[PDB]
C-alpha cells in the first residue's frame, strides 16, 4: 500500500494455498555475478541460477505427504501480502522431505520464475 | 560533528535511497597485505581488493526485486550520518539475492571506490 511492508507471504501450488510457517524464502532465477581479480580487479563473471521457494507445512493437514513427495510438474505461485507476485511453472519438489515433529520442509524448485501482476 | 560518531548509514542507488536495515557493511577497494615468514619474518605482500556494500531491504517496497536482480551498471553511494561519503561507479549486484521472510540481501559490488566530499 502507501507505507505497507511485507509481513507475510502466501504460497499456492496448483491453486491450493499451502499452510506455510513463518520465514518463507524465495530466490529469483537469474544470473549470479562473481568476482575476478588477478594483478588488479577486472570485473565480474556470470553463472545461471534457478528459482527456489522454501517453507514449512504442519503435519496432518489436508495435503498428504505422499502427494508432496510426488510433485514433478506443478505450478508454484509466491505472493507477498503487499501484492508482489511471482509465478513458477513446471516446478518440482527438491531435496529430502522430512517430517520432524510435525514439520515438513518444502524446497519447491523451478528453472525460471517471472514476476506476474 | 564535534563529537558525533557514526550511528546509521545511508545507501543510494542511482539517486534512490535504499530502505536499508541496521548493520550495513562497507569494504573499501585497495590492497590487502599478507604475512611472509620463512626462517624469520621478512615483510608483507599485496593483493588487490574490490569495494563491497552490504545491506538488507524489506520486501514489498517501491523498488521491485526484478529491478534488484537486473543491476549490471549502476552508481552506488555510501554515506555515513556524520558526513563521510564514498562513491562506487559502474557497480553491480553480486551473489544470490534471496527474499527470506521479507528480507532481501544486497551485495552491491564495484571494482573501485573513492571518498568524495
Amino acid at each position: 500500500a502507501g507505507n505497507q511492508r511485507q509481513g507475510v507471504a502466501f504460497i499456492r501450488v496448483n491453486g491450493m494455498e499451502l499452510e506455510s510457517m513463518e520465514g518463507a524464502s524465495f530466490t529469483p532465477s537469474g544470473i549470479t555475478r562473481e568476482e575476478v581479480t588477478g594483478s588488479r580487479v577486472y570485473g565480474w563473471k556470470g553463472k545461471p541460477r534457478a528459482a527456489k521457494v522454501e517453507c514449512k507445512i504442519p503435519g496432518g493437514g489436508p495435503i498428504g505427504l505422499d502427494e508432496i513427495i510426488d510433485w514433478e510438474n506443478i505450478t508454484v505461485e509466491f505472493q507477498a501480502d503487499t501484492g508482489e507476485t511471482w509465478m513458477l511453472a513446471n516446478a518440482w519438489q527438491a531435496d529430502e522431505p522430512k517430517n520432524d515433529g510435525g514439520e515438513i520442509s518444502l524446497v519447491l524448485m523451478a528453472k525460471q520464475s517471472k514476476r506476474i501482476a | 560533528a564535534g563529537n558525533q560518531r557514526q550511528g546509521v548509514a545511508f545507501i543510494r542507488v542511482n539517486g534512490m535511497e535504499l530502505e536499508s536495515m541496521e548493520g550495513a557493511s562497507f569494504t573499501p577497494s585497495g590492497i590487502t597485505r599478507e604475512e611472509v615468514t620463512g626462517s624469520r619474518v621478512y615483510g608483507w605482500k599485496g593483493k588487490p581488493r574490490a569495494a563491497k556494500v552490504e545491506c538488507k531491504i524489506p520486501g514489498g517496497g517501491p523498488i521491485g526485486l526484478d529491478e534488484i536482480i537486473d543491476w549490471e551498471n549502476i552508481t552506488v553511494e555510501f554515506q555515513a550520518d556524520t558526513g563521510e561519503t564514498w562513491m562506487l561507479a559502474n557497480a553491480w549486484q553480486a551473489d544470490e539475492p534471496k527474499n527470506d521472510g521479507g528480507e532481501i540481501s544486497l551485495v552491491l559490488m564495484a571494482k573501485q571506490s573513492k571518498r568524495i566530499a
Binding site: - | 539517486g15 535504499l18 568524495i116 566530499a117
Partner: protein, 494 residues
C-alpha cells in the same frame, strides 16, 4: 528498403531463393547517427537532382546518375565512398556560378622521328596514345581527342582545331569543363611517372585560360540543409563570401543554444605565399584547411579523401592524434613541388594543416589543426588549435547530455540541506555533483581526461536564484595530452 532491389518484385510468394547480379558496388544503408557528414559540390548538365536539396548517396553509380557523369559532386562522392563505407553520406548540389566554360587548350606540333608513346595527364587521369614513326602532331591530337571522348569521367570536353598558315603538323585541342566555377580549371602534365618521355621531334605545350570564374552562391543550400547534426562538412569553394556564411552557420550551431556541433574540412591549392596569406587571414576555430602546391588532381578530391579519413578516425577515437594516416588513391605532387621542413613548420604556425609523402608513393596526413590563431584581444592562443580538442569537447558535451537525460528523465529540484528523506524523487546539487564525478571517472577510464583531484576541487554545483528551475554548474576538465615530438640526443664514443 535498405537494399534497393532491381527486377525483383516486392510481392513474391513462391518459396525459393532469388539471386541477382549487379556490377555497381552499393554501400549498406545502415543508419549512423554519430557519423553524419555533408558535402557541397557542383552539378553539371543532364542532372536529375534538384538544386539545394540534400540527398543520401550510397554508391558511386547513383551519384553519377543523380549529378551527371564527370561532375564535381559525383567525383567527390566516389572519392569519399572509396575510403569510408561506414558513415552516412549526404550530398547537396549547387548552381552554376559565373564565368566561362573554357579552361585552356593543348597545343601539339612537330613530327615524331621515332617510335614511342605520348602520355597526357589531364585532371590527374592518365591518357596514353601510341606514337608511330613519322606521325604528325595533327594525328596525335585527333587520337587524344578520341581518347578523351572515350573517357567519361574527365570533367572536360575536348575538340580538335587546326588553322593558320603554319605546318599541317600543328593542331591544338580546346578543352571546356562540364561546369563553371573557380575549380573548373585543370592541370595538364605529360610525364608523371618514371620511364616516360615525349617522343623525339614532338613539341607539346599548354596555354591556360585568361578569364576568372566565381563560385556559386550557397545561401539557398545553407538554408536548406535541415536540422540534423552534420558532424563533418566538405566545402571545396575557398572564397570569402561563401566561407563567411559557413562560419556564421557553424558558430551558430557551435553555441550552447543549437548544440548541433559541426566541422568543415577544406583544401586550398596554390602557391606557398597564397596559402600563407589565406591561413593568416582566416581566424576561425571550426574550419581546418590543408595546403598543397602543384597537385595533379583537383583540390576537392583531396578534401573528400581527407574528410573521410579524419571522420572515421575521430569517430573511432576523439583523442588519438592524426599523425600517420594515409590517403588512399591520391597522387602526391612532384619532388620539387613538395614543401620543405621550414615551409611546413611555418604553415603549421600560420594555421594551415600539412601532409607528408610516405617512403613509397603514398600521401599521409602529418598534422591536422584549425584556423584559430589569435585571441580575442589580439594575443596568441593555443586553445582550440588541434582538431582533437574540438572532437573531444563535442564528445564530452554529447556524453554529458545523454547521461543527464537518461539518469534523470524528469525530477524535482530542492535546495541543499533540506530534509526530503527516502522515497521522494527530488534532486540535490550534491546528487548532480556525484553524478558528474562518476561520469568524469568514466571519461578518465575511457582515455580522455587525466587529472581527477583538480577536477573535483574545481567543481561547483548550485541552484539559480532567479529561474528556480535551472541548475547552474561550472566544471573544468583537463584534456589529456598527445605524443607529438620525440627529441633525442645521441652521444657517440668513437
Amino acid at each position: 528498403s535498405d537494399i534497393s532491389f532491381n527486377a525483383i518484385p516486392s510481392d513474391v510468394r513462391v518459396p525459393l531463393t532469388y539471386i541477382e547480379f549487379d556490377n555497381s558496388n552499393a554501400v549498406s544503408g545502415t543508419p549512423a547517427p554519430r557519423q553524419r557528414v555533408l558535402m557541397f559540390g557542383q552539378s553539371g548538365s543532364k542532372a536529375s537532382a534538384a538544386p539545394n536539396v540534400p540527398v543520401r548517396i550510397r554508391s558511386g553509380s547513383q551519384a553519377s546518375a543523380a549529378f551527371g557523369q564527370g561532375s564535381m559532386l559525383a567525383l567527390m562522392a566516389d572519392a569519399f565512398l572509396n575510403a569510408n563505407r561506414v558513415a552516412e553520406l549526404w550530398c547537396i548540389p549547387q548552381g552554376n556560378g559565373t564565368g566561362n566554360a573554357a579552361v585552356g587548350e593543348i597545343s601539339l606540333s612537330g613530327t615524331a622521328g621515332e617510335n614511342g608513346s605520348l602520355v597526357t595527364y589531364i585532371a590527374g587521369q592518365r591518357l596514353a596514345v601510341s606514337v608511330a614513326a613519322g606521325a604528325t602532331g595533327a594525328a596525335l591530337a585527333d587520337l587524344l581527342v578520341a581518347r578523351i571522348k572515350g573517357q567519361p569521367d574527365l570533367p572536360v570536353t575536348a575538340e580538335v582545331r587546326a588553322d593558320s598558315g603554319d605546318d599541317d603538323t600543328h593542331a591544338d585541342v580546346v578543352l571546356s569543363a562540364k561546369f563553371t566555377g573557380a575549380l573548373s580549371a585543370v592541370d595538364v602534365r605529360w610525364n608523371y611517372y618514371a620511364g616516360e618521355t615525349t617522343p623525339y621531334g614532338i613539341i607539346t605545350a599548354f596555354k591556360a585560360a585568361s578569364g576568372k570564374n566565381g563560385n556559386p552562391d550557397i545561401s539557398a543550400s545553407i538554408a536548406g540543409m535541415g536540422d540534423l547534426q552534420y558532424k563533418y562538412i566538405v566545402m571545396p569553394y575557398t572564397d570569402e563570401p561563401n566561407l563567411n556564411l559557413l562560419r556564421t552557420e557553424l558558430q551558430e550551431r557551435w553555441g550552447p543554444v543549437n548544440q548541433a556541433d559541426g566541422f568543415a574540412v577544406t583544401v586550398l591549392s596554390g602557391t606557398y605565399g597564397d596559402i600563407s596569406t589565406f591561413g593568416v587571414s582566416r581566424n576561425d576555430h571550426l574550419i581546418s584547411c590543408m595546403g598543397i602546391a602543384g597537385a595533379p588532381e583537383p583540390s576537392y578530391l583531396y578534401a573528400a579523401t581527407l574528410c573521410a579519413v579524419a571522420s572515421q578516425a575521430l569517430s573511432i577515437d576523439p583523442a588519438r592524434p592524426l599523425q600517420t594516416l594515409t590517403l588512399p588513391g591520391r597522387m602526391p605532387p612532384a619532388v620539387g613541388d613538395r614543401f620543405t621542413w621550414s615551409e611546413r613548420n611555418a604553415l603549421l604556425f600560420d594555421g594551415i594543416s600539412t601532409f607528408n609523402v610516405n617512403d613509397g608513393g603514398e600521401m599521409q596526413i602529418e598534422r591536422m589543426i584549425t584556423m584559430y590563431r589569435t585571441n580575442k584581444y589580439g594575443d596568441s592562443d593555443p586553445s582550440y588549435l588541434n582538431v582533437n580538442t574540438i572532437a573531444t569537447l563535442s564528445y564530452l558535451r554529447y556524453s554529458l547530455r545523454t547521461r543527464i537525460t537518461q539518469k534523470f528523465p524528469n525530477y524535482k529540484l530542492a535546495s541543499d540541506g533540506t530534509r526530503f528523506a527516502t522515497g521522494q524523487a527530488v534532486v540535490t546539487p550534491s546528487v548532480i555533483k556525484t553524478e558528474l564525478l562518476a561520469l568524469f571517472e568514466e571519461w578518465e577510464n575511457a582515455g580522455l581526461v587525466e587529472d581527477f583531484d583538480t577536477f573535483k576541487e574545481e567543481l561547483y554545483v548550485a541552484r539559480n536564484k532567479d529561474d528556480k528551475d535551472r541548475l547552474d554548474v561550472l566544471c573544468g576538465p583537463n584534456l589529456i595530452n598527445q605524443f607529438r615530438i620525440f627529441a633525442a640526443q645521441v652521444q657517440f664514443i668513437l
